[PDB]
Amino acid sequence: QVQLVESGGGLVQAGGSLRLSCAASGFPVKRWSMTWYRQAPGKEREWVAAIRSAGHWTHYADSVKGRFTISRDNAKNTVYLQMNSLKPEDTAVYYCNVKDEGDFSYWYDYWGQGTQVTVSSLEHHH
Amino acid sequence: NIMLTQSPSSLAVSAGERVTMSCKSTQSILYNSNQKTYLAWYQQKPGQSPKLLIYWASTRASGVPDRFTGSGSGTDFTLTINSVQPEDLAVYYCHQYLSAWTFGGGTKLEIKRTVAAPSVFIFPPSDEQLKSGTASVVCLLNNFYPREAKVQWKVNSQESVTEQDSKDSTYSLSSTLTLSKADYEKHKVYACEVTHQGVTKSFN
Amino acid sequence: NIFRLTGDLSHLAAIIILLLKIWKSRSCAGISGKSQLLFALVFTTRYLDLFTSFISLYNTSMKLIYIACSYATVYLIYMKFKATYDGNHDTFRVEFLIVPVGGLSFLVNHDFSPLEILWTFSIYLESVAILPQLFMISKTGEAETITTHYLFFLGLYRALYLVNWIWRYYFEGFFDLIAVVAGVVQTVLYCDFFYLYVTKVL
Amino acid sequence: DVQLVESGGGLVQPGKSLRLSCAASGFTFSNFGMHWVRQAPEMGLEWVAYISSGSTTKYYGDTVKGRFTISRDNPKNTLYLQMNSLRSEDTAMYYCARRPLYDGDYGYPMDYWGQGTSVTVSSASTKGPSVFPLAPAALGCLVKDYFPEPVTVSWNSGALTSGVHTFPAVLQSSGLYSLSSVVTVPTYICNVNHKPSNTKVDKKVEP
Amino acid sequence: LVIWINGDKGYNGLAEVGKKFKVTVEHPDKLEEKFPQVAPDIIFWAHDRFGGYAQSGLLAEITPDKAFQDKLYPFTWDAVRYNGKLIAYPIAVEALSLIYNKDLLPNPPKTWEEIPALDKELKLMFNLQEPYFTWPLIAADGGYAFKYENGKYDIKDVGVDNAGAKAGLTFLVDLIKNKHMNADTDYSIAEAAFNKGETAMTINGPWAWSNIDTSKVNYGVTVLPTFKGQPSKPFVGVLSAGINAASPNKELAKEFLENYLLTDEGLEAVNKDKPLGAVALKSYEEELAKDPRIAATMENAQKGEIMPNIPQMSAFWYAVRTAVINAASGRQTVDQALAFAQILIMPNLTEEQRNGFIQSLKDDPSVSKEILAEAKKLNEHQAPTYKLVINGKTLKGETTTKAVDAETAEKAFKQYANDNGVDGVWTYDDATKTFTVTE
Ligand SMILES: OC[C@H]1O[C@H](O[C@H]2[C@H](O)[C@@H](O)[C@@H](O)O[C@@H]2CO)[C@H](O)[C@@H](O)[C@@H]1O
Structure with a gap:
């Protein structure tokens, strides 16, 4: 059994930056794939980024490509999502999903609890 | 969001x-x-x-x-x-x-607030409307509360209620019954009976 | 995730149907023993981690079922019912497949590690596994043991992975370019297999 | 005082484009950000668009993004909302609102709103209203067979508003709108204005 | 007076010049960075740093003289022209050039590609730490600090991501990995090695010549080798004299610069200490252009491009230095280093935004182009009919319709009037497009 913990979410101004991290606890698998999804209240769950266990393959949604960047840490068994130039349209609960990419492992499909990212479109006086 | x-x-x-x-x-x-x-x-x-x-x-x-x-x-x-x-x-x-x-x-x-009695008024279709080939008879419920009130038509009818006014806290309702020229011409008397918590209006 | 489950169950059904037909008919004529050898080697190479770090009873059980069924098919073709087996018409050169596939697994893999190399080699060999059977039927023109159920289950298996790839790419944002390309090659080869069987055997 | 008056609303076919304007006065329009917020009976208040004081920042709602564009002419003190590829769900009363200065510091939300303009989207063509008298105590005018249902009915050009009752328009079986405006009295003219058809009719009521 | 100049220039000759004029000369390290934070009466430095100083107001706008302006070359004055005002007196024009050993080799290499073979046979080494020396190779194939169009530098366009910049940087790191130059060699190492003759050739400016003259090894000064069939484009330096804004002796220092330093005798006494290069004065430059090394410096300057005077040049220099050091030491790849340089140049980005974009570049270089595009977008965002008139007995009004034909228009109006209960005589004014019915 594997437990996923997500951290790094919070309240950031529009255009700011954030670093989310999904840490997996339990016995690692040789070949796995982790996907960052997001869900805003009353909206469908959409995938944000996707990375595998080995290689240089990363896939990004059309909306977040260039702003969001997914990376891995096999030694620490963690996956990081860096959010740059955030806009209030990126306010959602961000989930991390681990799938066993080997054969015959259909039920090795674990979801994180969820982390809250809120982009506050406020104006300030210098 | x-x-x-x-x-x-x-x-x-x-x-x-x-x-x-x-x-x-x-x-x-x-x-x-x-x-x-x-x-x-x-x-x-x-x-x-x-x-x-x-x-x-x-x-x-x-x-x-x-x-x-x-x-x-x-x-x-x-x-x-x-x-x-x-x-x-x-x-x-x-x-x-x-x-x-x-x-x-x-x-x-x-x-x-306290229940108030409606005022029931009658309004027959005009000659200008009859010239067009249609008729509408309108019953008016003035200054009634609560909003729940029943209107019955005696010889197509749609009722619209005003929003409660802030000055007095009353409702007003308008029940308009629509007919063709022949359908209006056939009948001789038109009445509406209004039942409210707190009366029939007719014309020949 | 049910698409990959259904495809794997269809593939296991196809393997079991072929094994049972060989057992019942008391002959393996019309089957390329080299294709089944390549399938056995695919399952061996992909599931070499069976001994170490079992994940679940279903996982290791399915790996063992696949390995045992393929080995039993190879044994029936080459050891039990080799008399009915006709190697004269199955003259395909297996090394001509294994060597280029091994080189391609070395070159085009995602990462250069023994397990990743083995997985990529197994994927590529599965992609080109059915070629000896295609050659054998293209030569003989008939398949006394290949059944409509076997081909139907194989085609269902391929179509289920096709739908699975589309679903994963459009909903999970996941595509495995090596796996997708090798599976497309395998699907084309299986479509040609069905074409040859219907046009020449039926 | 701060004043925001909108204009441009009316009836359009689905997929068409309409430009709404909001003239602002009583304050420096080039200093404040501006919102467009629409309200529909099955929708409630819903924010639509936002533009900053310098037009640098533009935000749009999820259901309006890619179709609606907001802009502003600062020296002309005008705010513009260009709507393209309109749908039936876009029928609403549209308000232009003023975003106060530095809501991250002082905390003021949208403070001043316009009266809004009705934007209705339907293939049905416009039809001028027909006014009929109601013989009188209370007397009134029945406005029937008009589309859409922006309509302002007053009495004696707003001379008397005590005891006057105007009723919400309801869908008629013919696809048109109808309502009656009445008033209790001890010569009265009912004045009806239908903006989409530009119909201004001044009618007398007699027994 | 208090004078700051770089350590590799002729500070002793300046000392005698000030002695004849008390004048104090000092050569602190990192003075190009010390001067802004500290604030010296007059500072001697290349013009690229000076414009930014003028933005801070640290350089006092000095009124020139027309005859004195004509005493110097016009392009040198153009170098110290920022926003239409002259902030400095040009002193010397310096450009990088190849200095080789005649004993080690008779003919210098005509291209960069020939260098690996000659170096492995000997088994070139210049200062790779500063981006000034490594920029000619980068810019040989079109890499540019800022796009120069119609007399202006477009800060929005930075060319350090060009294919030519990548080609130059990867050529340099290939030469580093092939053990042809030490990754951590600097100016002192280059001078020491070339003085002893260990290195056949090195890239350097006029100032080092006297040092080489002390080594008494015969040296030839010539064109920088061409990279992929295109000439190297070294930035051209205009060593210039800037006045401190807070200098209590501004007039005295200005008079000293005009009447002792920028004269034939003063510049002759300065060039003797360390070669100034192409001298700003017309007379001394004419007397000095006969030397082949000055000719080589001038032709290299013609092949190169003068540095912009814009204040975005310090950030550009820091970013390019970081990228070159990273690529040379092997800590980062060439493309990643150049992407970092682009991120670091972008002025309007917040520090945390810049750190986030740098991290995004670190942990995924497959989408570096998209990250750069998004960062540039954020950086630019943060930049500082017919008519009817009815007149009945009971109702009167007006109504407009959309009609193409007047016959159907009045048919529709007549039907509408019947629906309105109107019966009266009809009139039509086509000019006003009005149908009027009245009872
Ligand atoms: O970092 C590169 C450097 O280039 C220039 O500095 C030159 C200067 O022009 C020469 O006279 C001599 O001092 O070598 C310097 C390089 O160390 C720019 O003037 C300077 O801003 C920049 O940092």
Whole structure:
């Protein structure tokens, strides 16, 4: 059994930056794939980024490509999502999903609890 | 985007009563920089633009009567009126302006009072309308409360009720029955019987 | 995730149907023993981690079922019922497949590690596994043991991975370019297999 | 005082484009950000668009993004909302609202709103209203067979508003709108204005 | 007076010049960075740093003289022209050039590609730490600091991501990995090695010549080798004299610069200490252009491009230095280093935004182009009919319709009037497009 913990979410101004991290606890698998999804209240769950266990393959949604960047840490068994130039349209609960990419492992499909990212479109006086 | 839900959808309170209405947010709308909760309460009187009542979920906007108070934190907020006036009949919205701008569903506040007798008036179709080939006979219910009142047509009928007025707290209803030229010509008397909690009007 | 489950169950059904037909008919004529050898080697190479770090009873059980069924098919073709087996018409050169596939697994893999190399080699060999059977039927013109159920289950298996790839790419944002390309090659080869069987055997 | 008056609303076919304007006065329009917020009976208040004081920042709602564009002419003190590829769900009363200065510091939300303009989207063509008298005590005018249902009915050009009752328009079986305006009295003219059809009719009521 | 100049220039000759004029000369390290934070009466430095100083107001706008302006070359004055005002007196024009050993080799290499073979046979080494020396190779194939169009530098366009910049940087790191130059060699190492003759050739400016003259090894000064069939484009330096804004002796220092330093005798006494290069004065430059090394410096300057005077040049220099050091030491790849340089140049980005974009570049270089595009977008965002008139007995009004034909228009109006219960005589004014019915 594997437990996923997500951290790094919070309240950031529009255009700011954030670093989310999904840490997996339990016995690692040789070949796995982790996907960052997001869900805003009353909206469908959409995938944000996707990375595998080995290689240089990363896939990004059309909306977040260039702003969001997914990376891995096999030694620490963690996956990081860096959010740059955030806009209030990126306010959602961000989930991390681990799938066993080997054969015959259909039920090795674990979801994180969820982390809250809120982009506050406020104006300030210098 | 932070969704907002409002409860109750609509409620009625007598004049001078204390009323409390709640807004629930899908997440906390507290700002970390200034520790101020970014929620506001707006009041929309019938046929009017929304008017700001409260901001920062506690602070009262300039010119607002003292009977309006804002409270709450986290994901639950309340708007309280200590002495509901007949003028306070409006739709109240909660609005979070931290992440984008979203509004609540709307809590429509009505006014309760003593039952009042309707005034039933009759209005026959005019000659100008008859020249066009159609007729409409209109029955008028003036200054009645409660809104629930039954109208029966005696020889197609659609009834529309006005919103409760803030000055007096009354309702008015109009029941229009439509006929063709032949259908109107066939019958000789037209009547409407009005049953209300607090009378038949006819013409030949 | 049910698409990959259904495809794997269809593939296991096809393997079991072929094994049972060989057992019942008391002959393996019309089957390329080299294709089944390549399938056995695919399952061996992909599931070499069976001994170490079992994940679940279903996982290791399915790996063992696949390995045992393929080995039993190879044994029936080459040891039990080799008399009915006709190697004269199955003259395909297996090394001509294994060596280029091994080189391609070395070159085009995602990462250069023994387990990743083995997985990529197994994927590529599965992609080109059915070629000896295609050659054998293209030569003989008939398949006394290949059944409509076997081909139907194989085609269902391929179509289920096709739908699975589309679903993963459009909902989960996941595509495995090596796996997708090798599976497309395998699907084309299986479509040609069905074409040859219907046009020449039926 | 701060004043925001909108214009441009009316009836359009689905998929068409309409430009709404909001003239602002009583304050420095080039200093404040501006919102467009629409309200419909099955929708409630819904924020639509936002533009900053310098047009640098533009935000749009999820259901309006890619179709609606907000802009502003600062020296002409005008705010513009260009709507393209309109749908039936876009029928609403549209308000232009003023975003106060530095709401992150002082905390003021949308403070001043316009009266709004009705934007209705339907393939049905416009039809001028027909006014009929109601013989009188109370007397009134029945306005029938008009589309859409922006309509302002007053009495004696707003001379008397005590005891006057106007009723909400209801869907008629013919696809048109109809309402009656009545008033209790001890010569009265009912004046009806239908903006989409530019129909201003001044009618007398007699027994 | 208090004077700051770089350590590799002729501070002793300046000392005698000030002695004849008390004048104090000092050569602090990192003075190009010390001067802004500290604030010296007059500072001697290349013009690229000076414009930014003028933005801070640290350089006092000095009124020139028309005859004195004509005493110097016009392009040198153009170098110290920022926003239409002269902030400095040009002193010397310096450009990088190849200095080789005649004993080690008779003919210098005509291209960069020939260098690996000659170096492995000997088994070139210049200062790779500063981006000034490594920029000619980068810019040989079109890499540019800022796009120069119609007399202006477009800060929005930075060319350090060009294919030519990548080609130059990867050529340099290939030479580093092939053990042809030490990754951590600097100016002192280059001078020491070339003085002893260990290195056949090195890239350097006029100032080092006297040092080489002390080594008494015969040296030839010539064109920088061409990279992929295109000439190297070294930035051209205009060593110039800037006045401190807070200098209590501004007039005295200005008079000293005009009447002792920028004269034939003073510049002759300065060039003797360390070669100034192409001298600003017309007379001394004419007397000095006969030397082949000055000719080589001038032709290299013609092949190169003068540095912009814009204040975005310090950030550009820091970013390019970081990228070159990273690529040379092997800590980062060439493309990643150049993307970092682009991120670091972008002025309007917040520090945390810049750190986030740098991290995004670190942990995924497959989408570096998209990250750069998004960062540039954020950086630019943060930049500072017919008519009817009815007149009945009971109702009167007006109504407009959309009609193409007047016959159908009045048919529709007649039907509408019947629906309105109107019966009266009809009139039509086509000019006003009005149908009027009245009872
Ligand atoms: O970092 C590169 C450097 O280039 C220039 O500095 C040159 C200067 O022009 C020469 O006279 C001599 O001092 O070598 C310097 C390089 O160390 C720019 O003037 C300077 O801003 C920049 O940092």
